Write a protein that binds this ligand. Structure first.
Ligand SMILES: [Zn+2]
Ligand SMILES: [Zn+2]
Ligand SMILES: [Zn+2]
Ligand SMILES: [Zn+2]
Lengths: 585, 620, 187
RNA sequence: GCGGUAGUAGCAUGCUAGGGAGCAG
RNA sequence: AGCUGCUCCCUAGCAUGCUACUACCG
């Protein structure tokens, strides 16, 4: 009994075949219920026939006969069609505006989340429809994943090694760090707490959260939520006022904040200044230096997951007193610099899944590109701050959409903020990148990065390029091709001083296989933001649309500030990047 | 009966609800899971579950009515104004409630004095008033439960009295009904602690589906729910300056008691010509019919009536339990043997020995009757009939059998002795025989603790049926009260009816071609209802007028009295009604310019409209 | 009710009858154009009398579901009220005295009458007269129910603070005289 | 000339619902 | 601030029932 989604009018009718059960006014409901695959409408009572044994539940056919609603084959003479005038029968029949062009909502309703175009329309429409599309997308996500293979491991191989059995008739979903399960312990009646763990190459090896000893009888699933409706938009309306509103001018600053002063003012002088960030330019330092500039401000540490606020926790030990902060964690093993559940404290350390709804001055939204509109708009519901801070950039990598099937999402459509830096521009500019030497930062410039990144140090002269040979063979979800592994080990013998690296690969199963032959650790490309090594190892292994994507590989290119080896089965970036090439054994 | 005797030995902190700790999504509660009765022993619930997930509407309703969490979270209380057991104080201060005086309708009094009333030495004078009370009125009225004492019974005599009493209730039918078949008059009354913080009975009868009420009713057949009763003061006209209170029972009790008892209660109130006369009207010739039914064909008849001192606060618990069992005997096909026991336990835990909120504190009630529960006026009648039958048994068994001249009555006495103290099960033939004997020589007309009896005089002078002294003795040893013979009456001439019944006197008048019996009230009651009111709006006559029409209906039969100052009351009322109509109509012609037409409103100030209400050809 | 399919038909029947009345030719003029009119009788009877019943039934239905929506909202309101009350009285309760007596019980059950008697922190006494005051709580500490209590505050029937010096045998007739004593459990 | 039905108006009896008041236990 | 029973007044509605006027067919 509230406003409908497309008309802002009080109604009482809900699409029965939708997933959200949204409010739709009488003419607006007629439009949607004739123009799509939504065939049912519910009111204060469900518009269904009352003759025992009826299951035809369309919209037009039903007939109202007093204290009941019939079908034409169920109908005593005193009646009227429930569908007439192009207007379904329900409360507030008059004062509904309706809408003629509702094919956008119609497509969102019929959008089954397979094509890229689904995401394109879902990110091109207006606000509350943005919300409807987002929540339908996440609901369909959990319909997708939970109904797949049961993680019923029916024996233990060895220490951190298991034997696997899975659901029949329904296939089994990936076993990667992008896909985290959740444990339930069976007793003679029901289930008990186990927790979330990951599976990898074994014969199943599990990268467990913490120590556990499970015998037979146990099995796992990846649990989810029951996502409820939201409240607020993706962002607040902008400002162009005259004041640094709500805060206090400055006396002290450290001169390493020289590039910090110029952008402090713009974030607080107007509603929001949306931050774009190249890898390792000092953004978190800036996001910590915000409170350094004004000791009196409340700024709310957010992220995609806690592991990035743990980064803002790591540098919290560096700068600010521990008596003004609180690290909120839901009732998991993460970083905790402070005490939990102290909301009323100045510094708010949490993530989008943690903080209770309050009000604050500035919210430091971290790693935006790995967030979709839903988790982007939640804090807009929880926290009505006057100023926003969006640490992130669509330029790095988007959140894992398992329904990426046909096409690939461009950073124009990762979220609304993601095209916002591409429509109004980034209201952020930091040219001093402490990450990379004269090789990479100069190279990432012409890549996508606005020709704004350029050298800080000189050339370290070992960040070389080597384009490879390439042969293709896949098994389930990634590929193992020791051809791409062969030159790694065989050219490493030329440099024994090359044992300080990590072997990253787009095919996450390669690191689990390569470590048997190579010994350097593992790392997943898409969840590798923030972490860097001095010397790094990679093989692109192909130039399909998953890894070497010109905006999306660039997390692991700015990895090295000393030396790299970019093994290329590729043409995407070789003649595009700016390094030197050697011979292949 | 044995439990009543043995329970006076044990500490009084051991009776009442038994509580336990449960978890609702990891947060601990304290709830009732049983009961320790003084009469029924220890009772344990059958559906108890620790570690539940949520609470429905029904479980919230049950946990809110529990006294467990209200008393477990208040202060300790030591109230020295009473001898009753005090439990807890639910706030930080005590509340002292008063009662206000009445409002004076000066217009009616002036009109009545200009017609010759209230003269020196008149037979009609004012004796009904609104009496005021001060702050200590509620607790001093609650302290009258010190007259309830533990009473053990003659069990072999009671087990025979109950069979005869049951024979009195054979023409009716009862059983359980569903939630869509119960009927509520006036859904705009209070729901009773803690539920009067949020709405009236309409709120809870609307928020509950027909299937939630059925679930709650089915729940009370395996579990016990204790509730809380609130004590309220009344604001009414009276002839004595003592304060009056009523018990307000909570909604969780009424909702289920209606489903248990309403079929039988509505069967009783639709029967004519029986001993219990609840539901019979006195209008359109009904008073005459009742009087002729009670006269029956008794031989050398007299009339008699008696009273009960402190009836609702001196009733022993055993007779209250017995009344409940007699009322529940009609469930032989719908309810099992365990279901009926749990319904009895629920009744005892809610309206017999429950927790009472007087002021803002909780006390323990020893026993007696709660005035405002769902079965009051019918249990009172059962208690009445039980006491009368006991009086007759004691009259007949305490008579020297060697001097009885009739040979039928001697065998009756012999067999009555050996059906009390020698026979162990029920003998149906002798119960029928004794019932017939009583119905012929001892005829009763019963409302809820009022009575009139027509009896054989020659039998009573020889001690073969009950007299007024037998009632005195029975009340002394089975009720713990002394009944003074200055509040009883007797009448040896039948052509003037009962001296009193439901506050009415009787007159044999000539109506048309024959003679009929009419009821009339005390004139002071009607005049006092004229002069003193409980709202200031009722001190202007032209705003209602219907009040005076109704009060004139009540006063019509005084026109036939031999005392001339009694007919003047009816005539005064008619004159006043005419004056009020004229003064209301002569306002719309001056203050405004509205011409009202006398659309047959002249019938109200003529005697035919009122005479028609006492003549046998209905129009109800 | 004028835009019905038969308003035009009865209109044209009476219009032709008007045309013939301006004509006035034959006996069939009367018979016919009183029967062009006498056919357009059922139109404007059923089409204007069955349209007079469907609308009443529609209004009935709309009012009824208005009622049901309001009754459905008040239910949620009272649900929230009851929940808040229960969880509020929950937080004056979960002490360690309670768990201490509960764990000493052999099966988990205890009488309810001994919980305020053994776990409450505050006591309230109501005194009718001075003679009772002397025998119950004279001094500044007294013992009741196997414990020691310590007085804080005394008020009278008007909720006004009395001081312990005023309560005397010769000042007694100047006090509003139920007095209410508040004490705290001594440790 | 009558019957049947369909409309419209006025009148009574009964049932239900809502509101106002009076008495009794 | 309660549970019951009875009675008066006012409005709404439903069907029913009686009764009157018009039309159509037989
Ligand atoms: Zn709409
Ligand atoms: Zn729909
Ligand atoms: Zn149907
Ligand atoms: Zn039953």
């Amino acid at each position: 009994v509230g406003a409908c989604v497309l008309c802002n009018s009080q109604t009482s009718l809900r699409c029965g075949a939708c997933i959200r059960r949204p409010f739709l006014c009488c003419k607006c409901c007629y439009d949607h219920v004739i123009s799509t695959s939504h065939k049912l409408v519910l009111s204060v009572n469900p518009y269904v026939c009352n003759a025992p044994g009826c299951d035809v539940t369309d919209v037009t056919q039903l007939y109202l006969g007093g204290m009941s609603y019939y079908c034409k084959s169920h109908k005593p003479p005193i009646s009227f069609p429930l569908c007439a005038n192009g207007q379904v029968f329900g409360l507030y029949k008059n004062t509904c505006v309706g809408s003629d062009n509702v094919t956008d909502f119609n497509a969102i309703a019929t959008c089954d989340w397979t094509n890229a175009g689904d995401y394109i329309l879902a990110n091109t429409c207006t606000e509350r429809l943005k919300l409807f599309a987002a929540e339908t997308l996440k609901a369909t996500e959990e319909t997708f994943k939970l109904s797949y293979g049961i993680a019923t491991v029916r024996e233990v191989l060895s220490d951190r090694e298991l034997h696997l059995s899975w659901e029949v008739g329904k296939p089994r979903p990936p076993l990667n760090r992008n896909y985290v399960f959740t444990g339930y312990r069976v007793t003679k009646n029901s289930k008990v707490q186990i927790g979330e763990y990951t599976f990898e190459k074994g014969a199943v090896v599990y990268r467990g959260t913490t120590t556990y000893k499970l015998n037979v009888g146990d099995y796992f699933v990846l649990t989810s939520h029951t996502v409820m409706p939201l409240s607020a938009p993706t962002l607040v309306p902008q400002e162009h006022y005259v004041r640094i509103t709500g805060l206090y001018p400055t006396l002290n600053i450290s001169d390493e904040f020289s590039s910090n002063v110029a952008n402090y003012q713009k974030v607080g002088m107007q509603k929001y200044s949306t931050l774009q960030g190249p890898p390792g330019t000092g953004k978190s330092h800036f996001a910590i230096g915000l409170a350094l500039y004004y000791p009196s401000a409340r700024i709310v540490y957010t992220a995609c997951s806690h592991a990035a606020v743990d980064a803002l926790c790591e540098k919290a030990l560096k700068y600010l007193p521990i008596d003004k902060c609180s690290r909120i964690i839901p009732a998991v093993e993460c970083f905790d610099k402070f005490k939990v559940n102290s909301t009323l404290e100045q510094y708010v350390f949490c993530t989008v899944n943690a903080l209770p709804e309050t009000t604050a001055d500035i919210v430091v939204f971290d790693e935006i590109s790995m967030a979709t509109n839903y988790d982007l708009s939640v804090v807009n519901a929880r926290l009505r701050a006057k100023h926003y801070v969006y640490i992130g950039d669509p330029a790095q990598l988007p959140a894992p959409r398992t329904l990426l099937t046909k096409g690939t999402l461009e950073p124009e459509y990762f979220n609304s903020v993601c095209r916002l830096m591409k429509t109004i521009g980034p209201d952020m500019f930091l040219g001093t990148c402490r990450r990379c030497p004269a090789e990479i930062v100069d190279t990432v410039s012409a890549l996508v990065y606005d020709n704004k990144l350029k050298a800080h140090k000189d050339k370290s002269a070992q960040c070389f390029k080597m384009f490879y040979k390439g042969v293709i063979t896949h098994d389930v979800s990634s590929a193992i091709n020791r051809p791409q592994i062969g030159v790694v080990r065989e050219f490493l013998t030329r440099n024994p001083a090359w044992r300080k690296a990590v072997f990253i690969s787009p095919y996450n199963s390669q690191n689990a296989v390569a470590s048997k032959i190579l010994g350097l650790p593992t790392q997943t490309v898409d969840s590798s933001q923030g972490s860097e090594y001095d010397y790094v190892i990679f093989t692109q292994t192909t130039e399909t649309a998953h890894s070497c994507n010109v905006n999306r590989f660039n997390v692991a290119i700015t990895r090295a500030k000393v030396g790299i080896l970019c093994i290329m089965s590729d043409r995407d970036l070789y003649d595009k990047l700016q390094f030197t090439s050697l011979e292949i054994p | 009966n044995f439990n009543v005797l043995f329970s006076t030995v044990f500490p009084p902190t051991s009776f009442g609800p038994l509580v336990r700790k449960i978890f609702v999504d990891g947060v601990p509660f304290v709830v009732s899971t049983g009961y320790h009765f003084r009469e029924l022993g220890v009772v344990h619930n059958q559906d108890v579950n620790l570690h539940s997930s949520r609470l429905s509407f029904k479980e919230l309703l049950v946990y809110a009515a529990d006294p467990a969490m209200h008393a477990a979270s208040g202060n300790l209380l030591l109230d020295k104004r009473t001898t009753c057991f005090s439990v807890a104080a639910l706030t930080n201060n005590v509340a002292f409630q008063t009662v206000k005086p009445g409002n004076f309708n000066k217009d009616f009094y002036d009109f009545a004095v200009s017609k010759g009333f209230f003269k020196e030495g008149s037979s009609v004078e004012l004796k009904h008033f609104f009496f005021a009370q001060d702050g200590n009125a509620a607790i001093s009225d609650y302290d009258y439960y010190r007259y309830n004492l533990p009473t053990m019974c003659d069990i072999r005599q009671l087990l025979f009295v109950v069979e005869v009493v049951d024979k009195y209730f054979d023409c009716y039918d009862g059983g359980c009904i569903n939630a869509n078949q119960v009927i509520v008059n006036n859904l705009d009354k209070s729901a009773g602690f803690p539920f009067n913080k949020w709405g009236k009975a309409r709120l809870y009868y609307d928020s509950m589906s027909y299937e939630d009420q059925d679930a709650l009713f089915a729940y009370t057949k395996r579990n016990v729910i204790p509730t809380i009763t609130q004590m309220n003061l009344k604001y009414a006209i009276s002839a004595k300056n003592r304060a009056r209170t009523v018990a307000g029972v909570s909604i969780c009790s009424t909702m289920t008691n209606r489903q248990f008892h309403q079929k039988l209660l509505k069967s009783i109130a639709a029967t004519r010509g029986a001993t219990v006369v609840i539901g019979t009207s006195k209008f359109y010739g009904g008073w005459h019919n009742m009087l002729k039914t009670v006269y029956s064909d008794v031989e050398n008849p007299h009339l008699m009536g008696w009273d009960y001192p402190k009836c609702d606060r001196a009733m022993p618990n055993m007779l209250r339990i017995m009344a409940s069992l007699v009322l529940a005997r009609k469930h032989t096909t719908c309810c099992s043997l365990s279901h009926r026991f749990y319904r009895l336990a629920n009744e005892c835990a809610q309206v017999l020995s429950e927790m009472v909120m007087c002021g803002g504190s909780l006390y323990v009630k020893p026993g007696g009757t709660s005035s405002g529960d769902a079965t009051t006026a019918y249990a009172n009648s059962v208690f009445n009939i039980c006491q009368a039958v006991t009086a007759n048994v004691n009259a007949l068994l305490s008579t020297d059998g060697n001097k009885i001249a009739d040979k039928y009555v001697r065998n009756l006495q012999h067999r009555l002795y050996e059906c009390l103290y020698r026979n162990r099960d029920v003998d149906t033939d002798f119960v029928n025989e004794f019932y017939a004997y009583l119905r012929k020589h001892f005829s009763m007309m019963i409302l809820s603790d009022d009575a009139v009896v027509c009896f054989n005089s020659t039998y009573a002078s020889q001690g073969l049926v009950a007299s007024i002294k037998n009632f005195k003795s029975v009340l002394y040893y089975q009720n713990n009260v002394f009944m003074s013979e200055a509040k009883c009456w007797t009448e040896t001439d039948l052509t003037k009816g009962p001296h009193e019944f439901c506050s009415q006197h009787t007159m044999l008048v000539k109506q048309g071609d024959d003679y009929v019996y009419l009821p009339y009230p005390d004139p002071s009651r009607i005049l006092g209802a004229g002069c003193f009111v409980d709202d200031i709006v009722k001190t202007d006559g032209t705003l209602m007028i219907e009040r005076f029409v109704s009060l004139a209906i009540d006063a019509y039969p005084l026109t036939k009295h031999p005392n001339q100052e009694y007919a003047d009351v009816f005539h005064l009322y008619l004159q006043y009604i005419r004056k009020l109509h004229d003064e209301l109509t002569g306002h719309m012609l001056d203050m405004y310019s509205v011409m009202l037409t006398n659309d047959n409103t002249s019938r109200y100030w003529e005697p035919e409209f009122y005479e028609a209400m006492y003549t046998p050809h209905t129009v109800l | 009710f004028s835009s019905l399919p038969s308003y035009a038909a009865f209109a044209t029947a009476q219009e032709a009858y008007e045309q013939a009345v301006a004509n006035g030719d034959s006996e069939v003029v009367l018979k016919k154009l009183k029967k062009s009119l006498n056919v357009a009788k059922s139109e404007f009877d059923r089409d204007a009398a069955m349209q007079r019943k469907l609308e009443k039934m529609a209004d009935q239905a709309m009012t009824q579901m208005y009622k049901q929506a309001r009754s459905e909202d008040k239910r949620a309101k009272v649900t929230s009220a009851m929940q808040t009350m229960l969880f509020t009285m929950l937080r004056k309760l979960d002490n360690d005295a309670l768990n201490n007596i509960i764990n000493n019980a052999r099966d988990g059950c205890v009488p309810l009458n001994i919980i305020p008697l053994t776990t409450a922190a505050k006591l309230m006494v109501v005194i009718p007269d001075y003679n009772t005051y002397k025998n119950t709580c004279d001094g500044t500490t007294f013992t009741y129910a196997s414990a020691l209590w310590e007085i804080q505050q005394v008020v009278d029937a008007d909720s006004k603070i009395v001081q312990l010096s005023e309560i005397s045998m010769d000042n007694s007739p100047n006090l509003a005289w139920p007095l209410i004593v508040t004490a705290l459990r001594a440790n």
